[PDB]
Amino acid sequence: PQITLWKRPLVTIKIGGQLKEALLDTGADDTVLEEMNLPGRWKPKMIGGIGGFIKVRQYDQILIEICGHKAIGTVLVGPTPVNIIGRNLLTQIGCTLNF
Amino acid sequence: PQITLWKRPLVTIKIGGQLKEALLDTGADDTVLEEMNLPGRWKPKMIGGIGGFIKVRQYDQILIEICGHKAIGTVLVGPTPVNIIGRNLLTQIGCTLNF
Incomplete structure (x- = not known):
């Protein structure tokens, strides 16, 4: 799929049997999801962005279907509003920027 | 140019006669640059991200050359680390995501 950017690049993802909307973000080194329950063992971690760092939980080898393309990787969970x-994960689904 | 995402998508920009490196960010509604001097008249504004909002100055119709492609648009300036x-501006240079 080719996604233009006049609107936020939000796609449908499926994780842990749940359906959610997520932002395809070239400016994020990591994947961070709003609060939700995941497969058990996690390591503490912090992430920085504009205006302040937050604490998150790091889960490894988590399966995530992104707009129909499966990918397994590290997923963080914490107080992000989106x-x-x-x-x-974008590299796993072969996502690239083009102009 | 096709840019993969194994590394941060940083490109060379030219603004106000200055050369800088900037992140092509699909997750940013607006363009925000580190402190720098711009063409005069600006309006106050705030932007939110992960962990906290910051105050920035909004400048209109600012020329910016992004990896060789000129674009004119609103540019914010404030305390962002990148x-x-x-x-x-990504829509102006015809930038799209593809997978």
Whole structure:
């Protein structure tokens, strides 16, 4: 799919049996999702953005279907107001920027 | 140019006669640059991201050369640790996401 940018690049994702909307974000090193329950063992971690760092939980090898393309990777969970699909997963679905 | 995402999508921009590096960011509604001097008249504004909002100065119709492609649009200036090229300018250079 070719996605233009006049609107926020929001896509449908499926994780843990749940359906959600997430932002395909070229400016995020990592993938960070709003609060939700995931497969158990996690490591503490912090992430920075504009205006301040937040604490998040890091889960490894998590399956995530992004607009129909499966990918497994590290997923962080914490107090972000929007679901963010970062480069770690964008590279897995073969996503690129073009102009 | 086709840009993959294994590394941060940083490009060379030219603004106000200055050369800088900026992040092509699909997750930013606006374009926000680190502190710098611009063409005079500006309006106050705030932007939110992960962990907290910051105050910025909004400048209108600012010329900006992004990796060789000129674009004129609104550019914000404030305390961001990285130069961010948002969707308002990404649409002007015909930038799209593809997978």
